[PDB]
Amino acid sequence: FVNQHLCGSHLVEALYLVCGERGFFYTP
Amino acid sequence: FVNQHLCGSHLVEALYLVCGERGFFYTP
Amino acid sequence: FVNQHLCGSHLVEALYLVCGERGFFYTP
Amino acid sequence: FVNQHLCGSHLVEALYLVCGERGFFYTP
Amino acid sequence: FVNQHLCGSHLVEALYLVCGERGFFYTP
Amino acid sequence: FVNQHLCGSHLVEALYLVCGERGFFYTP
Amino acid sequence: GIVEQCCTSICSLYQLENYCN
Amino acid sequence: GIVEQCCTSICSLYQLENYCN
Amino acid sequence: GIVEQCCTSICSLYQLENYCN
Amino acid sequence: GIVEQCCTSICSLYQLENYCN
Amino acid sequence: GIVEQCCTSICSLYQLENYCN
Amino acid sequence: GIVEQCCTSICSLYQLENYCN
Ligand SMILES: Oc1cccc(O)c1
Ligand SMILES: Oc1cccc(O)c1
Ligand SMILES: Oc1cccc(O)c1
Ligand SMILES: Oc1cccc(O)c1
Ligand SMILES: Oc1cccc(O)c1
Ligand SMILES: Oc1cccc(O)c1
Ligand SMILES: [Cl-]
Ligand SMILES: [Cl-]
Ligand SMILES: [Zn+2]
Ligand SMILES: [Zn+2]
């Protein structure tokens, strides 16, 4: 639903910042 | 170093949109 | 309402990415 | 080419905020 | 709650743009 | 001048995430 | 148009592309 | 302050500007 | 996983860090 | 265009308003 | 990697799709 | 300031925390 899709996008930005040069897999 | 860092941020958002339910992997 | 305003902002980023060198008109 | 592309992304968000209900046009 | 956290993040971007070289304090 | 401006935008989002309930100050 | 359509259901990139020029 | 005000109604750029330094 | 966890409560940076590689 | 004007100098909000509909 | 390919040239959506799971 | 320190080198989250209230 739209709210979950929009939250994800914020979630990936937060992961980008936290994970740094480690990276991440994103699976929703 | 700031440019690659800021580029990655954009990259992550684009991968989020293009990958949908598959998710993606981000390796810096 | 706030939720629609916030959704729009995501919507324009998604259009930017999809439309590429074609561009878009955004009308809410 | 990446710099204009990443600039456009910011441009689009700013136009969204400044234009409100009028919307805007984005031509790259 | 998640919705308020997400709204904040949009709020700081809008303040960045409006306030310009003046800056701002953000207190939630 | 555009580069510092676009960097600030990213900076603001990162400060939002790292500071949580404390908030932050942004001085350009 | 776009807001009523894409803020009520997730629009795919194919749906969004209809709004391009 | 800002969250109670601007996450319950759309704040215009003029409303937001009150929070500038 | 991440969406059910972090879209229902605010995940801190410490919670998010669990999803890093 | 907006990219020539506003990716080479910082455009004000007033200047950006020239690209509203 | 994606940073070498896509921070030095503009990657299309098709190209970005190579980094989906 | 933050722009001098953090737009010329990548600031860690620890370093960014120096600009919290
Ligand atoms: O339905 C939507 C709403 C906002 C962004 C997006 O990619 C899709
Ligand atoms: O009321 C709001 C909330 C968030 C961003 C914005 O521009 C306005
Ligand atoms: O719980 C969340 C959801 C999205 C972004 C974030 O930093 C935390
Ligand atoms: O000149 C610019 C470029 C990008 C965003 C901003 O709003 C101003
Ligand atoms: O080549 C790129 C770099 C960053 C975002 C974009 O999606 C494409
Ligand atoms: O050094 C920086 C610059 C911008 C965002 C980031 O969080 C770190
Ligand atoms: Cl949102
Ligand atoms: Cl950028
Ligand atoms: Zn959002
Ligand atoms: Zn950027």
Swiss-Prot record, chains G, H, I, J, K, L:
Disulfide bonds join C6-C11. It comes from the Eukaryota. This is Insulin A chain. It comes from Homo sapiens. The chain holds residues 90 to 110 of 110 of the full protein.
